[PDB]
C-alpha cells in the first residue's frame, strides 16, 4: 500500500464527496435565481459528474456566484483527481522500469 496508491484512493473517495456535496450545494445556491436550471438534486448530480470531467452540455451551467464557486471547486477536485491517478500510474511504471534494468 504505497503512497501514490493511497493518495489516489483518497482522491477518488474525496471526489465522490465533493460531487455529492457539490450537487447539494448547487441546488441551494441556484434556487432563487430566475431561469436557473440546476434546481433539482438528481440533475445537479449529473451536472457535477460532467463538470468534474470538464464537460459542459449546452446551457447546463450555474448562474449564481456561489453556484459558480461550487463549479470551480468541483472542476479543481475533478482535475486534481484525474491528475493524481496519472501521477500514481507514472510512479508505478517508472518503478518497474527500474526493476527492468536491474537498477
Amino acid at each position: 500500500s504505497a503512497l501514490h496508491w493511497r493518495a489516489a484512493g483518497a482522491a477518488t473517495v474525496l471526489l465522490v464527496i465533493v460531487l455529492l456535496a457539490g450537487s447539494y450545494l448547487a441546488v441551494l445556491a441556484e434556487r432563487g435565481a430566475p431561469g436557473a436550471q440546476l434546481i433539482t438534486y438528481p440533475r445537479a448530480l449529473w451536472w457535477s459528474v460532467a463538470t468534474a470531467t470538464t464537460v459542459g452540455y449546452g446551457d447546463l451551467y450555474p448562474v449564481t456566484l456561489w453556484g459558480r464557486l461550487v463549479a470551480v471547486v468541483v472542476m479543481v477536485a475533478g482535475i486534481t483527481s484525474f491528475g493524481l491517478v496519472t501521477a500514481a500510474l507514472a510512479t508505478w511504471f517508472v518503478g518497474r522500469e527500474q526493476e527492468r534494468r536491474g537498477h
Epitope: 441551494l28 431561469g35 434546481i39
Partner: antibody, heavy 118, light 106 residues
C-alpha cells in the same frame, strides 16, 4: 398517515398580519423543501415560496408582491409563513407541500382558509 | 419564468371513453412536468411525475404522454370519481409554475 398538518382557518383584519403553521411527520430529510401555494376562490394554484428547514434559506415569488416571509423551527419540524399588510386580495386557501427537491410536490397539506375582513 | 397553457379550459366527455388534457409550455422543458388532480374542497393530489412516470396508489387508467412543449394527460374509461380540476406543473427552471387548469365534466 397524514404527513402535513395545517390549521383549518385563520381570520385576519384588513392591514393586520398573520403567521401560518405547517408541521410534518413521516420521512423528514435534511434535503426536504417546504413550499406554499395560494388558491383564490374559483382560481388556479399560485406558487408563493419555498424553504429548506435545515438551513433556513427561503425563496419567494417575485412576480407577485412579497407579502410573505418564511421561517422554520427545526426541533418541531414545523414551517411558518409570515404574511403582513393583507387586503381582500389575500383572502385565499393556503397550502403547504413537501418537495423532496426533485420538482414535484408529493404530499400536500389540508389548507388554511384565510379570510380578510373586519 | 415558464408559462404553462392548458387548453381547453372545460372538457366534457362521455362515460367510459378516453380523454386527453393538453398542457403547453412557453419553451422546451424536456420531461420536467407533473400532473395534479384536485376535486371540490379537496387538496391537490399528484397523478403523474416526470411526464409519464406513474405514482403508486394512482389508478392504471391514468397515463402521461409528451416531451418538449406538448404534454398530455390521458384517462381510459372515465368514471364519476375523475370529475375534478387538473393541473400541470413544471420544474425545469426556477421558479416553479402551474397551469391555469382544466376541469373535467362527464
Amino acid at each position: 398517515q397524514v404527513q402535513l398538518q395545517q390549521p383549518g382557518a385563520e381570520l385576519v383584519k384588513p392591514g393586520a398580519s398573520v403567521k401560518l403553521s405547517c408541521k410534518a411527520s413521516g420521512y423528514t430529510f435534511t434535503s426536504d423543501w417546504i413550499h406554499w401555494v395560494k388558491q383564490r376562490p374559483g382560481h388556479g394554484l399560485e406558487w408563493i415560496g419555498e424553504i429548506i428547514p435545515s438551513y433556513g434559506r427561503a425563496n419567494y415569488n417575485e412576480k407577485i408582491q412579497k407579502k410573505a416571509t418564511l421561517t422554520a423551527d427545526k426541533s418541531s419540524s414545523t414551517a411558518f409563513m409570515q404574511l403582513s399588510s393583507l387586503t381582500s386580495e389575500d383572502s385565499a386557501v393556503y397550502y403547504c407541500a413537501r418537495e423532496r427537491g426533485d420538482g414535484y410536490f408529493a404530499v400536500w397539506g389540508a389548507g388554511t382558509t384565510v379570510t380578510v375582513s373586519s | 419564468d415558464i408559462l404553462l397553457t392548458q387548453s381547453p379550459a372545460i372538457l366534457s366527455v362521455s362515460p367510459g371513453e378516453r380523454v386527453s388534457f393538453s398542457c403547453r409550455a412557453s419553451q422546451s422543458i424536456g420531461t420536467d412536468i407533473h400532473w395534479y388532480q384536485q376535486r371540490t374542497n379537496g387538496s391537490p393530489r399528484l397523478l403523474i411525475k416526470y411526464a409519464s412516470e406513474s405514482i403508486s396508489g394512482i389508478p392504471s387508467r391514468f397515463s402521461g404522454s409528451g416531451s418538449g412543449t406538448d404534454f398530455t394527460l390521458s384517462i381510459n374509461s372515465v368514471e364519476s370519481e375523475d370529475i375534478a380540476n387538473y393541473y400541470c406543473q413544471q420544474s425545469n427552471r426556477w421558479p416553479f409554475t402551474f397551469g391555469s387548469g382544466t376541469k373535467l365534466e362527464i
